[PDB]
Design a protein around this motif. Structure first.
Motif, short mmCIF file in Angstrom:
data_model
loop_
_atom_site.label_atom_id
_atom_site.label_comp_id
_atom_site.label_asym_id
_atom_site.label_seq_id
_atom_site.Cartn_x
_atom_site.Cartn_y
_atom_site.Cartn_z
N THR A 23 1.30 -0.94 0.28
CA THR A 23 -0.19 0.28 0.15
C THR A 23 0.75 1.47 -0.21
O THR A 23 1.09 1.62 -0.80
CB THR A 23 -1.27 -0.25 1.23
N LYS A 24 1.20 1.50 0.98
CA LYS A 24 2.22 2.84 1.10
C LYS A 24 3.41 2.99 -0.07
O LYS A 24 3.50 4.52 -0.15
CB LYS A 24 2.34 3.25 2.70
N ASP A 25 3.98 2.40 0.26
CA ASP A 25 5.34 1.83 -0.02
C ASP A 25 5.45 1.20 -1.87
O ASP A 25 6.55 1.07 -2.03
CB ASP A 25 6.42 0.83 0.49
N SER A 26 4.21 0.83 -1.82
CA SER A 26 3.94 -0.26 -3.84
C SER A 26 4.52 0.87 -4.50
O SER A 26 4.84 0.96 -6.01
CB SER A 26 2.46 -0.04 -3.80
N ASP A 27 3.95 2.20 -4.59
CA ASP A 27 4.30 3.45 -5.89
C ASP A 27 6.23 3.06 -5.93
O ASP A 27 6.47 2.93 -7.04
CB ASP A 27 4.16 4.84 -5.64
N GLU A 28 6.76 2.95 -5.14
CA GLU A 28 8.29 3.29 -4.54
C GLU A 28 9.20 1.59 -5.36
O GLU A 28 9.73 1.44 -5.78
CB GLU A 28 8.80 3.40 -3.17
N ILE A 29 8.05 0.66 -4.51
CA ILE A 29 8.71 -0.48 -4.38
C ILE A 29 8.84 -0.69 -5.85
O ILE A 29 9.08 -1.81 -6.70
CB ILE A 29 7.99 -1.51 -4.30
N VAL A 30 7.65 -0.94 -6.41
CA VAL A 30 6.81 -1.65 -7.98
C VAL A 30 7.86 -0.90 -8.91
O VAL A 30 8.50 -1.95 -10.50
CB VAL A 30 5.50 -0.82 -8.53
N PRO A 31 8.56 0.34 -9.52
CA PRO A 31 9.35 0.45 -10.84
C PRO A 31 10.99 -0.26 -10.26
O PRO A 31 11.40 -0.18 -11.86
CB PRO A 31 9.62 2.21 -10.44
N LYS A 32 11.11 -0.93 -9.08
CA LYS A 32 12.30 -1.24 -8.76
C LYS A 32 11.94 -2.94 -9.22
O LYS A 32 13.32 -2.78 -9.14
CB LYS A 32 12.82 -1.42 -7.23
N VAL A 33 11.16 -3.92 -8.63
CA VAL A 33 10.92 -4.72 -8.72
C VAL A 33 10.63 -4.84 -10.39
O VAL A 33 11.14 -6.50 -10.90
CB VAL A 33 9.76 -5.28 -8.14
N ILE A 34 10.06 -4.18 -10.82
CA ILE A 34 9.04 -4.24 -12.33
C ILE A 34 10.32 -3.33 -13.40
O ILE A 34 9.49 -2.57 -13.52
CB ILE A 34 8.23 -4.32 -12.58
N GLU A 35 11.30 -3.99 -13.63
CA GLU A 35 12.40 -2.97 -14.70
C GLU A 35 11.50 -1.72 -15.29
O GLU A 35 12.15 -0.88 -15.65
CB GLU A 35 13.78 -3.75 -15.25
N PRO A 36 10.88 -2.39 -16.85
CA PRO A 36 10.21 -1.20 -17.14
C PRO A 36 9.95 0.08 -16.60
O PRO A 36 9.63 0.42 -17.44
CB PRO A 36 9.45 -2.19 -18.18
N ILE A 37 9.28 -0.46 -15.95
CA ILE A 37 8.25 -0.14 -14.82
C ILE A 37 9.05 2.10 -14.53
O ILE A 37 9.79 1.24 -14.04
CB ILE A 37 7.47 -0.05 -14.19
N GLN A 38 9.19 2.70 -15.06
CA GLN A 38 9.80 3.72 -14.57
C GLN A 38 9.71 4.53 -13.20
O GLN A 38 10.33 5.23 -12.80
CB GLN A 38 10.19 4.90 -16.14
N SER A 39 7.90 4.47 -13.44
CA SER A 39 7.99 5.14 -11.98
C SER A 39 5.96 4.80 -12.19
O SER A 39 5.73 4.67 -13.38
CB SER A 39 8.00 7.12 -12.54
N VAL A 40 5.98 5.28 -10.86
CA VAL A 40 4.15 5.35 -10.67
C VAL A 40 3.61 6.67 -9.85
O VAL A 40 4.11 7.36 -9.31
CB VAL A 40 3.61 4.43 -9.50
N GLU A 41 2.71 6.97 -10.48
CA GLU A 41 2.16 8.95 -10.73
C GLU A 41 1.11 9.28 -10.37
O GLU A 41 -0.27 7.87 -10.46
CB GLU A 41 2.56 9.69 -12.17
N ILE A 42 0.58 9.26 -8.92
CA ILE A 42 -0.69 9.97 -8.61
C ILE A 42 -1.36 10.92 -9.50
O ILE A 42 -0.28 11.81 -9.53
CB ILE A 42 -0.85 10.22 -7.37
N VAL A 43 -1.82 10.97 -10.01
CA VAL A 43 -2.33 12.24 -11.15
C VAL A 43 -3.82 12.43 -10.50
O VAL A 43 -4.40 13.78 -10.72
CB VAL A 43 -2.78 11.06 -12.66
N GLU A 44 -4.56 12.05 -9.74
CA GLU A 44 -5.45 12.12 -9.16
C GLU A 44 -5.88 11.79 -7.70
O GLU A 44 -5.72 11.00 -7.82
CB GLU A 44 -6.97 11.42 -10.24
N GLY A 45 -6.38 12.93 -6.88
CA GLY A 45 -6.52 12.74 -5.69
C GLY A 45 -5.31 12.35 -4.73
O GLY A 45 -4.49 12.55 -5.01
N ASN A 46 -5.22 12.63 -2.65
CA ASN A 46 -4.57 12.55 -2.44
C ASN A 46 -3.89 10.84 -1.90
O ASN A 46 -3.27 10.65 -0.54
CB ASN A 46 -5.10 13.26 -1.24
#
Length: 150
Positions: A23-46
């Motif tokens: 949950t809290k740390d997914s956005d940071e972990i995902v681009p590390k563990v799945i190399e082609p993913i560059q970033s996870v960006e919050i586009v709407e919401g808090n």
């Protein structure tokens, strides 16, 4: 149609620690563990329910996720894949309802209920042959398993 499946995975990781990674740390972990993913960006919401994230990968592409619900006290979180790469054309969305339960010896159990929202009345063989239900849980859990101090 809505075709629901239940997936489960035992983990040695402590419940609250696993849930935090998911949950809290997914956005940071995902681009590390799945190399082609560059970033996870919050586009709407808090960051809470209702929050939309754009997962950007490289050809640049994106996947959209929606946080549907979260209840930290009960270690539950619900999110959907709502567009973009890797969402079958037969599908409106894929929804995940997850709960982290206590296991023996201070471990965890991940209960993952995956719901395929189909445009038609049939869940294709192509979708059925999916790891759509457990893939992202598995990648995050393996990361925290190997890297508890991340």
């Amino acid at each position: 149609g809505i075709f629901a499946f239940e997936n489960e995975q035992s983990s040695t990781v402590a419940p609250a620690k696993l849930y935090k990674a998911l949950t809290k740390d997914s956005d940071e972990i995902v681009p590390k563990v799945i190399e082609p993913i560059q970033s996870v960006e919050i586009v709407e919401g808090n960051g809470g329910p209702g929050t939309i994230k754009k997962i950007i990968a490289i050809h640049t592409s994106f996947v959209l996720h929606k946080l549907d619900a979260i209840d930290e006290a009960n270690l539950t979180y619900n999110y959907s894949i709502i567009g973009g790469e890797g969402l079958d054309e037969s599908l409106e969305k894929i929804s995940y309802e997850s709960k982290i339960l206590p296991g023996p010896d201070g471990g965890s159990i991940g209960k993952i209920n995956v719901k395929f929202h189909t445009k038609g009345d049939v869940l294709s063989e192509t979708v059925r042959d999916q790891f759509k239900g457990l893939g992202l849980f598995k990648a995050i859990e393996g990361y925290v398993l190997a890297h508890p101090d991340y």
